[PDB]
Amino acid sequence: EVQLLESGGGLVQPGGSLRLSCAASGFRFYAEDMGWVRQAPGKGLEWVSSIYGPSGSTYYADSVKGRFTISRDNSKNTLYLQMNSLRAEDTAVYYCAKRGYGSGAFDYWGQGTLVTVSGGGSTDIQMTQSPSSLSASVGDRVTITCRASQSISSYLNWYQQKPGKAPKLLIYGASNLQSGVPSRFSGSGSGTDFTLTISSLQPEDFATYYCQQDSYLPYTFGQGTKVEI
């Protein structure tokens, strides 16, 4: 089928370097937008870099600018992340991601690998999520809020992440339900204020939920909402 096959990582020393790689198979388009995300232990998903166009233009979060280089070979359908001058801050699970044609959103993800370390005058868009955590029961209704720092229309995505595993896209475009995703999950809003609703909470739905935008660089996730028992 379609899959991002990730490889690389391991234990390294401060000052050291590492190269992640991501091989796509089952691609039906040339040079779709790709990037890398990371998650520091007991922290939220963090966008690291993006690459876009046949030119292979790049963007990078402030934390890693200067040290990390994203690249890709569109021929061999492979994605690379060269990580230099690593610090203990860089300790995280790193995931590769690809933008899907059907959704417009990053909906194909590598399984992730642990790394351990022993302009135009544009505006950045920030996302605030509410609440941080909540505790509920099977059959409970749950709502989660997302406030963007700038009106971004309907360009807001919701993701579920279970611990260790790659995030899963539930809603794209503020309200369009991703294919093969139960219809108890539903999204609303527009402009700056958005809402993910779970109508009847099920055992499998305990996880962390994140809002995210994919349209305006730099891409960001909100801080996440943990839904625990």
Q: Do residues 72 and 58 lie in contact, with contact meaning Cβ atoms separated by under 8 Å?
A: no
Task: Write out the two tokens for 120.
Answer: 């135009």
**Rounded Cα distance, 202 and 29, in Å:** 36
Q: Prior bond to 218 cis, omega within 30? A: yes
At residue 158's C-alpha, the angle toward residues 45 and 95, to 5°, is: 35
C-alpha to C-alpha distances, 103 to 40, 172, 223, nearest whole angstrom: 27, 6, 23
**Rounded Cα distance, 118 and 129, in Å:** 32
Q: Prior bond to 203 cis, omega within 30? A: no
**Inside any domain, residue 111:** yes
Strand partners, 179: none
At residue 42's C-alpha, the angle toward residues 15 and 126, to 5°, is: 90
The resolution in angstroms reads: 2.5
**Inside any domain, residue 73:** yes
Domain end (from 120, 155, 174): 120
Which of 141, 125, 142, 131 is closest to 191 using CA atoms?
125
Task: Write out the two tokens for 36.
Answer: 């890398």
**Rounded Cα distance, 105 and 164, in Å:** 21
Q: Do residues 68 and 48 lie in contact, with contact meaning Cβ atoms separated by under 8 Å?
A: yes
- In a shared domain, residues 116 and 147: no
Which CATH number covers residue 201?
2.60.40.10
- In a shared domain, residues 33 and 70: yes
Domain span at residue 82 reads 1-120
Which of 59, 64, 56, 105 is closest to 83 using CA atoms?
64
Tokens 């971004």 sit at which residue? 152
Which of 134, 140, 105 is closest to 225 using CA atoms?
134
- In a shared domain, residues 101 and 136: no
Strand order in the sheet with 68-73: 3-7, 18-25, 78-83, 68-73
User: Where on the phi/psi map is residue 204: left (φ > 0), alpha (ψ -120 to 50), or beta?
Assistant: alpha
Q: How many domains does the chain contain in total? A: 2
- In a shared domain, residues 115 and 146: no
Domain end (from 94, 120, 146): 120
DSSP states of the chain as a string? --EEEEE--EEE-TT--EEEEEEEES--SSS--EEEEEE-TTS-EEEEEEEETTTTEEEE-TTTTTTEEEEEETTTTEEEEEE-S--GGG-EEEEEEEE-TTTSSEEEE---EEEEE---------EEEE-SEEE--TT--EEEEEEESS--TT--EEEEE-TTSPPEEEEETTTEEPTT--TTEEEEEETTEEEEEESS--GGG-EEEEEEE-SSSSPEE---EEEE-
Domain end (from 81, 98, 120): 120
Give the method of determination.
X-ray
Q: φ, ψ for residue 152 (rounded to 5)?
A: -125, 25
Tokens 């059907």 sit at which residue? 102
Task: Write out the two tokens for 92.
Answer: 């995280």
